[model samples]
Target chain A: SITPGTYNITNVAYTNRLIDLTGSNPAENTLIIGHHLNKTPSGYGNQQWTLVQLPHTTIYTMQAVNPQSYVRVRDDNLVDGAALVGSQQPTPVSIESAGNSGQFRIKIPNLGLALTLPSDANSTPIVLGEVDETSTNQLWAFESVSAV
Target chain B: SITPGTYNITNVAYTNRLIDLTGSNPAENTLIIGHHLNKTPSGYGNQQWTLVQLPHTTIYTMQAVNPQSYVRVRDDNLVDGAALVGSQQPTPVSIESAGNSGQFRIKIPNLGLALTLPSDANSTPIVLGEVDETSTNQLWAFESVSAV
Candidate 1:
């Protein structure tokens, strides 16, 4: 289960870069995802995410701290390369930890698998695909940040 | 009941100042309460609070953004001047709105009265006191920040 806290999502495959939000444009809800997960600067709101559980459920919504965008499932489809979107109304995501080490699989009921960042080579946008527990790309890490 | 969001706990009468934490200290639990309610600094985590309700209850606990201190009912005498404290393991707070303008009274059943900031002066820390519907000091306000 998850609790209400602020954190940064990282690709298990790419240990350097983090899942970041693209340019902070429009200010309001807009589409921006697949932020390169490498080199985290100090006080980078783009990388920081706030996961707030919806009441008593394991389901959760994600928010990019900087520029403030909601992380939602793209059209609720479970297809690969279906670019994730950042908006005001983000989709609630369910998560099941594959194991400790701050790694977990992100689940969207509409999608057959979880959120997977297939490449650690560069800042490739995330997509929905099969759950390969052994593959580091499918595993995500959470780094708890300040709520302040 | 209160919805999950960002809010400014304002004194009913002194709408200028707000119930804020002293500073944005370490991310984990720390001391930073009795913030004088008067001015809001820009992007100041001290003034920002995230309200997450305790499981299965309208009772909610307040956290100071910068310090991440959970607002709790101190084991003080609960007298008119009993100051509120922010620390780990904060007691859940009970709120009763007196008006539609987001004005409400903060109550701690364990204590006899609600939280009251009786002055318009500077650095006047909040305290536990009687709830006088007619008094602005007894009337607190909640300004929802965001759902993201």
Candidate 2:
């Protein structure tokens, strides 16, 4: 496994742009659960996040593989930030489950995110969040410290 | 690169059998180091070691395409219970420097210890006593901490 540290979170659309705290895009929502220093508000703006205070020995889960699915802090908001983002309908089939390609997409509203999954039974649920514009809060560093 | 941690030192040997610290080797004088919590007078038996303190944010010189290496502790004295043990030869090597087939080893002396280098060029030296091994020593968790 790789050592825990600050990993740059990006968006699938603006592959060139890094995620910050102000950028918008509900589809680009990256949700990080578990212990973190910064927290998100109950609205659409300032959707991006910065990560800190990760448990020394806990596991972190990421939802997507592609840049689009990735979430980060940025400036602008989604074209329709108010539009309610929901789970994909006729859920994208997991390739492994269908004995086909290993690609599918799942929508998780609670997390305000969507995740594309490989067609494998081992794929876990992914959380999503709004893209952040320039906020360092979007970037997160995971540090494993001695457990209390 | 993997994060460092305290691994239980095991599978120790010197000349096929447990080494008699008081006795000299009849052959090429082979020495093996292992970990033990308690200190023993007879070179601490299996507890003798050369602890290396690796620092955070140190740019590890690349040895190979993957930049991987194996690190070991050594004792300078190779006899009594004196100062902390260290490497006479370099223990850490990059995947490139290590080459496709070669590996790295460290040596620990009694009074002062030096970090070994493969061929000298681009090597960084860590002074003895300048580094602490009292649990908080940096080298103690070289593998666990991310090196920038």
Global lDDT of each model?
0.64, 0.24
Report the number of the highest-DockQ candidate: 1
lDDT by residue (A7-104, candidate 1, tens digit) is 77767677765777766553543444445544434237777787766443355667776777787656645465666767666655667777656678
Error of 2 at A21 (Å): 4.6
Residue-wise C-alpha lDDT for candidate 2, range B1-148, written one tens digit per residue? 3233322222211111211111222222133222223333222323222222222211121111111122223432322222222222333321111111122222232122323211212212222233223311112211111222
Model 1 lDDT tens row, B91-132: 556666576665567776434577777677766777777765
Q: What's the TM-score of chain B for every model shown? A: 0.78, 0.21
Ten contiguous residues minimizing lDDT sum, candidate 2 chain B:
B57-66
Interface RMSD of 2: 21.8
- Alpha-carbon runs more than 4 Å astray in model 2: A1-22, A25-50, A53-148, B7-125, B128-148
